[PDB]
Scaffold this active site. Structure first.
Site, mmCIF file in Angstrom:
data_model
loop_
_atom_site.group_PDB
_atom_site.id
_atom_site.type_symbol
_atom_site.label_atom_id
_atom_site.label_comp_id
_atom_site.label_asym_id
_atom_site.label_seq_id
_atom_site.Cartn_x
_atom_site.Cartn_y
_atom_site.Cartn_z
ATOM 1 N N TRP A 139 -11.212 12.034 -2.482
ATOM 2 C CA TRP A 139 -9.765 11.868 -1.897
ATOM 3 C C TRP A 139 -8.826 12.185 -3.173
ATOM 4 O O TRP A 139 -7.873 12.855 -2.950
ATOM 5 C CB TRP A 139 -9.718 10.618 -1.637
ATOM 6 N N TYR A 155 1.067 -1.175 -0.021
ATOM 7 C CA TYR A 155 0.102 0.028 0.033
ATOM 8 C C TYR A 155 0.816 1.299 0.144
ATOM 9 O O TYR A 155 2.274 1.153 0.092
ATOM 10 C CB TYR A 155 -0.890 0.142 1.178
ATOM 11 N N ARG A 171 -6.714 2.548 3.095
ATOM 12 C CA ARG A 171 -7.671 1.592 2.686
ATOM 13 C C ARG A 171 -6.634 0.161 3.182
ATOM 14 O O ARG A 171 -7.478 -0.889 3.251
ATOM 15 C CB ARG A 171 -7.701 1.468 1.201
HETATM 16 N N1 LIG Z 1 -12.229 -0.414 -2.940
HETATM 17 C C1 LIG Z 1 -10.802 -0.711 -3.418
HETATM 18 C C2 LIG Z 1 -10.314 0.745 -3.614
HETATM 19 C C3 LIG Z 1 -8.817 0.569 -4.420
HETATM 20 C C4 LIG Z 1 -8.421 1.805 -4.733
HETATM 21 O O1 LIG Z 1 -8.647 2.709 -5.731
HETATM 22 N N2 LIG Z 1 -7.013 2.108 -4.286
HETATM 23 C C5 LIG Z 1 -6.561 3.350 -4.599
HETATM 24 C C6 LIG Z 1 -5.919 4.021 -3.399
HETATM 25 S S1 LIG Z 1 -6.740 4.247 -1.979
HETATM 26 C C7 LIG Z 1 -5.426 3.331 -5.657
HETATM 27 O O2 LIG Z 1 -4.991 2.070 -6.024
HETATM 28 N N3 LIG Z 1 -5.184 4.530 -6.225
HETATM 29 C C8 LIG Z 1 -4.141 4.759 -7.375
HETATM 30 C C9 LIG Z 1 -4.377 4.269 -8.621
HETATM 31 O O3 LIG Z 1 -5.680 3.852 -8.757
HETATM 32 O O4 LIG Z 1 -3.783 5.031 -9.582
HETATM 33 C C10 LIG Z 1 -10.098 -1.405 -2.112
HETATM 34 O O5 LIG Z 1 -10.754 -1.139 -1.038
HETATM 35 O O6 LIG Z 1 -9.227 -1.818 -2.144
#
Ligand SMILES: N[C@@H](CCC(=O)N[C@@H](CS)C(=O)NCC(=O)O)C(=O)O
Ligand SMILES: Nc1c(S(=O)(=O)O)cc(Nc2ccc(Nc3nc(Cl)nc(Nc4ccccc4S(=O)(=O)O)n3)c(S(=O)(=O)O)c2)c2c1C(=O)c1ccccc1C2=O
Ligand SMILES: N[C@@H](CCC(=O)N[C@@H](CS)C(=O)NCC(=O)O)C(=O)O
Ligand SMILES: [Ca+2]
Lengths: 198, 198
Positions: free
Chosen positions: B103, B7, B13
């Site tokens: 966010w 992460y 998350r």
């Molecule tokens: N509902 C998913 C959301 C996953 C998600 O959108 N994570 C984000 C960060 S919180 C991410 O990987 N963002 C960077 C990107 O998608 O490029 C979970 O709980 O794993």
């Protein structure tokens, strides 16, 4: 258990539950409320949201929690703990994208513009990830149908309304939809359910 | 088993999985990536999101699906199938709300508008519903802690960064946070973890 599902007269977030009931050949009251009922219905819900499913007088809520509850100890669940995790993960991936859309937006023109932008600029990357994920396999997880396949058919049905060409580059994802629609119990429900836009 | 969580350097998350590992006394690699390393790791993930969790060489995704996989057959799950559904439904009620925050938004006036709106209007309704839902009980579901109480603590920690008076009308919700934070394994994790805003 006696089962009472409460939702609007639409497929929406209740449809995944209705499919699982159809598939498992379990009787239930499909209670569809009118807009004008909503203030009374809502006063009795734990977090102001539907669907809810009452089970022997006890209230369950949250569509995917309820779908997961109903599939436990069935062939729809995932055949191992690892596959169960994958079923959940594909479901939440779909659910995350569905919740990007401004379903309740009042300004028509802005709702439209955002739907079109989401469907043109975002959906193709998810379609591609889902197709790559599925590869040449028959079902999204394991060697048998799970509720993740149901959820893909359900979600893509609504997306197709707003973006007819969504799956033009993705014959494999269309074949999956067809396989779900052909399961006899599911076909029967699809044929008989009230015809709604969403 | 051999566990590796990937992460960003934040609670976000991933934190729910970190509490579950702590509470169960399960060793894992807490892999925190740096922003400049993400595009290259991103391109290697089936769905381009984190968190992911590697289990003995196998990759899982979706933070709640993984949280569920980890607490299956533990005392952090509910005590019956109906209680497991309640635990799931609380977790998704909480998640639905967190996920309403933009966010990711880059337009600072639009992000700040939406935050203040959610926090001022929506959030109090959620607190009120959750406090009614808890009533005078010790934990949200059943008579012992579940990962839903953990999610409440994690979610409210972030919300309280932005709205410190959130719980001023709800002593029982504050007390529920303290209950979680006093569990020795959780207390030790909270004390030792990297200090990030979120
Ligand atoms: N509902 C998913 C959301 C996953 C998600 O959108 N994570 C984000 C960060 S919180 C991410 O990987 N963002 C960077 C990107 O998608 O490029 C979970 O709980 O794993
Ligand atoms: N999360 C939602 C939501 S949301 O409101 O909770 O964000 C909404 C939602 N659909 C969904 C679609 C329409 C409305 N309601 C709604 N709202 C407005 Cl501002 N206008 C209309 N008009 C309206 C009324 C009746 C029929 C058609 C229409 S129309 O949208 O085509 O104009 N309906 C509502 S409502 O419950 O918020 O009232 C949910 C869905 C989903 C899904 O997750 C989802 C997942 C898989 C398949 C389908 C859905 C899905 O349809
Ligand atoms: N994640 C939730 C979504 C719940 C939700 O926002 N439901 C809508 C119907 S689709 C609702 O009750 N809207 C009425 C309102 O918010 O006032 C679920 O799956 O049940
Ligand atoms: Ca979710």
């Amino acid at each position: 258990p006696n089962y009472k599902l409460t939702y609007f007269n639409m497929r929406g977030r209740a449809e995944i539950i209705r499919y699982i009931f159809a598939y498992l050949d379990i009787q239930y009251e499909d209670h569809r409320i009118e807009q004008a009922d909503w203030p009374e219905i809502k006063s009795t819900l734990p977090f102001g949201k539907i669907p809810i499913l009452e089970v022997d007088g006890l209230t369950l809520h949250q569509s995917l929690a309820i779908a997961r509850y109903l599939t436990k100890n069935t062939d729809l669940a995932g055949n191992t703990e690892m596959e169960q995790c994958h079923v959940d993960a594909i479901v939440d991936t779909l659910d995350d994208f569905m919740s990007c859309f401004p379903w309740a937006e009042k300004k028509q023109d802005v709702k439209e513009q955002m739907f079109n932008e989401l469907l043109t600029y975002n959906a193709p990357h998810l379609m591609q990830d889902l197709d790559t994920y599925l590869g040449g396999r028959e079902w999204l997880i394991g060697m048998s149908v799970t509720w993740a396949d149901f959820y893909w058919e359900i979600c893509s049905t609504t997306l197709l309304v707003f973006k007819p060409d969504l799956l033009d580059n993705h014959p494999r994802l269309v074949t999956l939809r067809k396989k779900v629609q052909a399961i006899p119990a599911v076909a029967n429900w699809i044929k008989r359910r009230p015809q709604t836009k969403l």
